[PDB]
Structures are given as structure tokens and as C-alpha cells.
Design a protein around this ligand. Structure first.
Ligand SMILES: [Fe+3]
Lengths: 17, 428
């Protein structure tokens, strides 16, 4: 998870439409 | 693209007719057209692929996940039919993987991509796509194994370079990651003009001391990835007011600020209580943002969700914060205690989004050694007072006191965000 920074490839989770 | 086998060529007239209906926009009429072509020619790969594309387009119109789950299956059925053209096999399975990630079935998209790589072991781009599948599920080890195979065959591929460099930088191999990032961006290959690689290349250069990091920050600003050389967040809503430092009256959350400053001692005392009787609830910073030092955090709210066990350790503070949805409902921010011990220096970094403003409540602030810089201005905390800054701007923290520094972090929605946006934005 991206909290104080941005070290992940994606910071969100896909759940469809 | 050769997509018709021998048998499909004999029925190219009926296939092109239904394909026109799909292209014209009669998705409902085209679905039933390919559906009967499949019923009439149950081994036609194109008629099965045409049924899958109609279900795909229909799932877009109806915004249905159940319809998309049906297309995902039909895309797999084209692979079971006999004498399927190689180009049709790649397109039918690649679309299945893409739609599987859209629904969040990340583990399923990995299996589909593994089948494609086993079917076409010479396609470099398919291996690169399999590496992205591992990076979306969190398996950086297997992603590194894939991009190593690509660079052993095609060492000039920039897509594999930027992803190999991203993994090395994630594994704290800062110096080794720079050449893979700088060369992959400069390769100009499709997929290398992503703001993520500009962000991590400039960050990697900043930690090693290369001043040319800002030349890469300005280049990302010119190509539209960063709002500025200072505000380098990537999950952004366009139009929001951008300034590194805010005042309480500017944010409009004046009721929240006063509740925090009027009751700051009870917030401090409940945090120190966790320090003295439950050190386990303070977890170390796990985002590699530290050059050195001890920095732990005790989170109460995260992604708009309340940790019941954490609110059992600070009950009065959770009850106080319960009255303000501007922070408890911020699904792109947290509410946490932050303890930082002497000898600590946090690297210059940027928050993931511009949709939140970050508040700092001074709880236990040593009289010297503590200072925080946002953009080009450095400020210090004060006990019982609230600092407000936009953490989407580059900020940096030092702690060089003789005792610990304890503050309270409260993230709020950006005030200029509409309530419809506050309810729709995906959580971070
Ligand atoms: Fe930060």
C-alpha cells in the first residue's frame, strides 16, 4: 500500500465497473 | 492479422456481416448473430471470437461484471477449438488477461499469461506482459526473473529496462537501478513514458547525490506526468488548489483544528499510554523512506476504515475524531500517531495523491533538532498546534534531538473536492 510514499507499482485495487 | 483458418475462409461472408453489426453499434443484434454462427459452425474460431468481442463491448455498455465474466470464458473457448490461427490465439487470450485484471482476478490473469508464454516462447512482449502480472500481484521476485530472461535475449528493450530498474529500486539497490531507468526512459520504446519511472529515477538520483535528478523531474513535468517539479504525485484530480503550506482558515476545517488544539493533551496522553504499555501497536515505517533512524507509526484510520483494535488503545481520541467525516472518510489518507527518534533523516519524497491535505498535531516536540521542509520552506512543530501542508509536494524531515518526537497525523480531503468525488475516488 502507498501511504506516506509511492513505492508500489500500483497504489489502487481493481474491482471492475 | 491473419485470423481466419481454412474453414472460416469458406464462411467469411457470414462472419463479416455480424462483425459489421458490432462495428455499427448494434451490439445486441451482433451478439445474437455470432451466437447463431457459433450454433451453426461450432468449430469456427472467428465466430467464437466474434461472440467474445460482442460480450466484451456489451459488458462495457451495461457496465456489468457478470457479462464480462462471460466474455472471459468465451475468450478461453477460442483456445480449445481446433486449427486456431496463431494471431487469433494471441488476441483472444491477451484480451482475457486484460479483462481479468480489470475485474481484479489478478491470479487468473497470471495463469492466462503463463499459458501464452508457454505457447509462444519466442514472443518477448508476452514475457514483458507476464512481468507486469507479477508486479500487480506483489511478486517482485518472479517479476525480476522474467525481465532477466528478456534482457538476456533482447538487452536493448527499454520496457524491460524500466521494469528491471523499478524492481532494483524497490529492493533498495539504488545505484544499480539508475542505469536501467535512465536507459529505458531514453529508449523511447512503447510503455517507457510513464511518470512512475521518472519519479523513481529522480528519487534514486537524489539519494545517491546526483543533482541531475531535477532535470528528470522537469522532463516529467514537460511531458505531463508531474504537475510541477515539486508536486510529483501521480494519482491526481486536475484543478485542485496546489500550495505546499496551508492555514486552518484556508482549508475550511476550522472545527477540526480547534477540536485538535483544544484537546491535544488527551491525544498525547493516549499515545504515550500506547508507548508505555503497548509498544507492539507502533509499527515501523515500511516504505523505505528512511535514510537512517527509527520511525514508527500507530494507525487508527486507514483508507477510511477504523481499526477496532487500535481504537481500543486510544478510545477517547477515536471518539473525538468520530465527529469529523472530513478525516475519517478520507479514503486516500490516514489518522495515526508518528514517533521519530534522534538520528533520523527521512528522504525527500512525495505522497501518492493530491486529493488529501496532511495535518500534524504537535504532541511531544523536543526544543531542538526537529524540522520539516516542504518545497523550499522549512518549518517546525509546536506542542498543541497544528501544521497543515500538501504532502504531494516534495518534503523532507530531520530528527536530531536528544529525545523522541511524537506527533499526530490527520489527513483530510482536499477542500475543493466535490462530495461526488469524495464518494467515487478509488481508495489509496
Ligand atoms: Fe511524507
Amino acid at each position: 500500500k502507498c501511504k506516506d510514499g509511492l513505492g508500489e507499482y500500483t497504489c489502487t485495487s481493481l474491482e471492475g465497473f | 492479422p491473419k485470423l481466419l483458418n481454412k474453414f472460416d475462409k469458406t464462411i467469411k461472408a457470414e462472419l463479416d456481416a455480424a462483425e459489421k453489426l458490432r462495428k455499427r453499434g448494434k451490439i445486441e443484434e451482433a451478439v445474437n448473430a455470432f451466437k447463431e454462427l457459433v450454433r451453426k459452425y461450432p468449430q469456427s474460431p472467428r465466430a467464437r471470437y466474434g461472440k467474445a468481442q460482442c460480450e466484451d463491448d456489451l459488458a462495457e455498455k451495461r457496465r456489468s461484471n457478470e457479462v464480462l465474466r462471460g466474455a472471459i470464458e468465451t475468450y478461453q473457448e477460442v483456445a480449445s477449438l481446433p486449427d486456431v490461427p496463431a494471431d487469433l490465439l494471441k488476441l483472444s487470450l491477451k484480451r482475457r488477461s486484460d479483462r481479468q485484471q480489470f475485474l481484479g482476478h489478478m491470479r487468473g490473469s497470471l495463469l492466462t499469461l503463463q499459458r501464452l508464454v508457454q505457447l509462444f516462447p519466442n514472443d518477448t512482449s508476452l514475457k514483458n506482459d507476464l512481468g507486469v502480472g507479477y508486479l500487480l500481484i506483489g511478486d517482485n521476485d518472479n517479476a525480476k526473473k522474467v525481465y532477466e530472461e528478456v534482457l538476456s535475449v533482447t538487452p536493448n528493450d527499454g520496457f524491460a529496462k524500466v521494469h528491471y530498474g523499478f524492481i532494483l529500486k524497490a529492493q533498495n539497490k539504488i545505484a544499480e537501478s539508475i542505469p536501467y531507468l535512465k536507459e529505458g526512459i531514453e529508449s523511447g520504446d512503447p510503455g517507457t513514458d510513464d511518470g512512475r519511472f521518472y519519479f523513481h529515477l529522480g528519487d534514486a538520483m537524489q539519494r545517491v547525490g546526483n543533482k541531475e535528478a531535477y532535470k528528470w523531474y522537469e522532463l516529467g513535468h514537460k511531458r505531463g506526468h508531474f504537475a510541477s517539479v515539486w508536486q510529483r504525485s501521480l494519482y491526481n484530480v486536475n484543478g485542485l488548489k496546489a500550495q505546499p503550506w496551508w492555514t486552518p482558515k484556508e482549508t475550511g476545517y476550522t472545527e477540526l483544528v480547534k477540536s485538535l488544539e483544544r484537546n491535544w493533551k488527551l491525544i498525547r496522553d493516549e499515545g504515550l499510554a500506547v508507548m508505555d504499555k503497548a509498544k507492539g501497536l507502533f509499527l515501523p515505517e515500511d516504505e523505505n523512506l528512511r535514510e537512517k533512524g527509527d520511525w514508527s507509526q500507530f494507525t487508527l484510520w486507514q483508507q477510511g476504515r477504523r481499526n477496532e483494535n487500535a481504537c481500543k488503545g486510544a478510545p477517547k481520541t477515536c471518539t473525538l475524531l468520530e465527529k469529523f467525516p472530513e478525516t475519517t472518510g478520507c479514503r486516500r489518507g490516514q489518522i495515526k500517531y508518528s514517533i521519530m527518534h534522534p538520528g533520523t533523516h527521512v528522504w525527500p519524497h512525495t505522497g501518492p495523491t493530491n486529493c488529501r491535505l496532511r495535518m500534524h498535531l504537535g504532541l511531544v516536540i523536543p526544543k531542538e533538532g526537529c524540522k520539516i521542509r516542504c518545497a523550499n520552506e522549512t518549518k517546525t512543530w509546536e506542542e498543541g498546534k497544528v501544521l497543515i501542508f500538501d504532502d504531494s509536494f516534495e518534503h523532507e524531515v530531520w530528527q536530531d534531538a536528544s529525545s523522541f518526537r511524537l506527533i499526530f497525523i490527520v489527513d483530510v480531503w482536499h477542500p475543493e473536492l466535490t462530495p461526488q468525488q469524495r464518494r467515487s475516488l478509488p481508495a489509496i
